Amino acid sequence: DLSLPSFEDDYFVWVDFSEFTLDKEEIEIGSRFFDFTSNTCRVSMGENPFAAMIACHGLHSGVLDLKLQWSLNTEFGKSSGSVTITKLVGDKAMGLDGPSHVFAIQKLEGTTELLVGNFAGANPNTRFSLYSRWMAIKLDQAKSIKVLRVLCKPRPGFSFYGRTSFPV
Amino acid sequence: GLAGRGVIYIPKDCQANRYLGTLNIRDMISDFKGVQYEKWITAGLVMPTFKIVIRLPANAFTGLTWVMSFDAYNRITSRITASADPVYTLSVPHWLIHHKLGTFSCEIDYGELCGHAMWFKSTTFESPRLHFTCLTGNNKELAADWQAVVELYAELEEATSFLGKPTL
Amino acid sequence: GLAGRGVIYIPKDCQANRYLGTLNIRDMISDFKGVQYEKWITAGLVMPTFKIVIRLPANAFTGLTWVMSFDAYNRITSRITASADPVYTLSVPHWLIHHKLGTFSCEIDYGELCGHAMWFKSTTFESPRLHFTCLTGNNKELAADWQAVVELYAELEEATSFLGKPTLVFDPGVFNGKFQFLTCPPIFFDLTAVTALRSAGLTLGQVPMVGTTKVYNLNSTLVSCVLGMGGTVRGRVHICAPIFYSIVLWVVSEWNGTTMDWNELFKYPGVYVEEDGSFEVKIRSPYHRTPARLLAGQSQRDMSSLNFYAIAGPIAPSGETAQLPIVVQIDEIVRPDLSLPSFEDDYFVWVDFSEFTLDKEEIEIGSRFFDFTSNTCRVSMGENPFAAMIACHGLHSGVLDLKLQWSLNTEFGKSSGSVTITKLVGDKAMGLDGPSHVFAIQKLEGTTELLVGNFAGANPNTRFSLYSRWMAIKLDQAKSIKVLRVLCKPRPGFSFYGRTSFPV
Amino acid sequence: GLAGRGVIYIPKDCQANRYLGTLNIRDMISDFKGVQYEKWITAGLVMPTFKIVIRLPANAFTGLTWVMSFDAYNRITSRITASADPVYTLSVPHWLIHHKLGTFSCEIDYGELCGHAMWFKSTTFESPRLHFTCLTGNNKELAADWQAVVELYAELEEATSFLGKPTL
């Protein structure tokens, strides 16, 4: 006799960025779904079953749809700049240019896809270096942002390999 | 056929939560070296179905129960080598080994339980381990220290793909 | 019938990389002049199927191998006339001419390999050339200078259309795994060595280089359309030496370095090569695939390579000194294990404009897809497979959907003006007004279509002037813009004509 | 499959009667070690049918002809190491290797040519050798020293009897 599922087929919180100390901020994502750290701003990670499933398998692979939302710290009339999504294939140094995307800060939201995977076919739950698509979020007026929230919604067929555990 | 082997050393006073040792699956096969090991070098990649056999003198007078834990991604190793809490040892795929039943056997479809194929020359992600811990201790110490033998049986053939079928 | 002819002069000491000469295909036909030349004048336009024949005294005692390179768009000429690196000569459609086989022949469907029809009175785009270069040299000089004769056979008839059938149609998700004209520069073995190794990298998306010059070509461009590949390499090996030279090779694939143990080496799945022939070798890798391109600080040897081990020889009689060359051709990846396509059916970056110095800025696009330059602002061009495909064909044609995005440099509340898209038919001076479009700067984004083409049907990859639709971006408050980004997404059926290369 | 291998060194001036080297058949298999070598350890005794392959660049411009002599009982080794009289090299089972024909191959039914089965751990009677000698020399020296590769192919299976069938 089961209850409702706790989550619906919807977005959930991946990460909130807040309390920016520098106007120039660049968050590298690459091809991973993982926990962020920053010396220049406050990272607040989401906790949900998807994140746990990532942590409880040796390998995973799939596509995440992202929704970015943000509110302003300064007056709207004074606002300038952008949330920019850099999309490459390769790396920052030698990569090819994909569907990079400039959201004027006044849009206050934006969407993008993220490939979680690589040429080999799957990601370990650690840092690794394997040729793949590469993503980054670039803020140029970060101090004007009170919060940048990133939600994700896995596309059907997001796959996990080799059940295991994760002590923290 | 027999692909690799190893030895676990049991102390005469085997208490609950005693760490007994870790076998490295790839080392078992390479140290043996091995009709199967040599087939492996030619295949390059293997996605074995192992039969694991633990040889073990059956005894109904001890109360001893052990746990073999399959840790393909080396996630609990660091935390059990002083003392193996059951919460760690049961958090990954595992099997109960009852002393009253003697010699123990099980199947590991490396395609499911692990998910990635093994490369003959080096560990790809992390090195797959078998941990042996004591779940319930002996009612009184035994006469002397002893050992059990762990054996890997497999017919290694070349793997067609890097990835297994997703567990989830 | 015989349509035209020409002569290539070979020197007595034909060293590898020697430039032998260039024949101009249209001049061969017009200087001959020519029952076929006269039929041509009446036709106006011709789309010939040529049989090219090179007459050439067969000889098994030299080791000479030449390359005929079909350069319909005059892309490698400048860079080969002093000396001909094989990276240039093999970057366009080409044929190996082995001296042991004597007289050589091949077909050139000008409709495919070139794409546009030939006008009797003058060159339309660029003048089509045949280059003759020496790939592997003679083992010792010959007795004297000599010559070979080049002949064009064709039955010219009037061409019905200007354009051929497209060699390639843009699709991100489509790289079969089959190649044409993929020839590796020669690999050399010294005879002063009892054994030896020569590696060939299998990271095929890497752009080949000659010094500091990048040589963009269709094959590497195709491979870059994928993240990586596994499977079996099917190819052909040519042993380019005199009959009195001989060698035995163990050919096998290895990952990240090579084993130092001869016994381990022979437990791998390789093949033996004693002579000219085809081969299949499995791409060997921990992931079953090797990546299509390298990341920073990576080397091609760090991945999967095709390794050529000389296990017996080479040997030759004394006192020969020449190295023994091996020329490898890769035909396809059979039983392919491909990665995801590197790009999806999505937009990609064409150009970013930034750092505007003047408030009035006008960017002319017209009907071309190309590299921008500005004295008044910063242009940052995108690099992707589509742009390479544009650069690796003589002609292209299609429609691009554009997305424009921009962010503000000044305060939003102070903003004024617009990003205006001017759309004409003709030119700025005498044109007709199409779907021109005014985006108030506060929209912060806009969309439009761009026709890449013209009344004739296709664009060359150079500047040209042919009546077509005409587009321009007009900024009136450009200093208020921190960046203007232009993304494009080719509509299905974007077509490319005549595979070639592009050195920069 | 490939069971063992070895290398013969040819001098640039390869004169008639020149001794080129001896390969020890059991050492070829054990140094390689060897899917077949490992099958051998389990069988204990083997009565192989070998395919011997000598890899060798074909050349019609030398006049070189070599002799491979199968000396299973080590009878001529002593008398051929400084110089190899054809009377010795041809007095045991042997094969002519013509340089014009390139890569050479033959079958050795160890049951006939030898007569006793091979024991994995040590030589039983004497240690079986292949001798490589030059029968007719090159017309003029070649450009440089070179080598040829000798390969043993076999599918080793357990021998049922110690003795073969009698040659005579």
UniProtKB/Swiss-Prot annotation, chain A:
Transmembrane spans: none
Compartments reported by the entry: Virion
Record's protein name: Coat protein
Region of the whole protein represented: 942 to 1109 of 1109
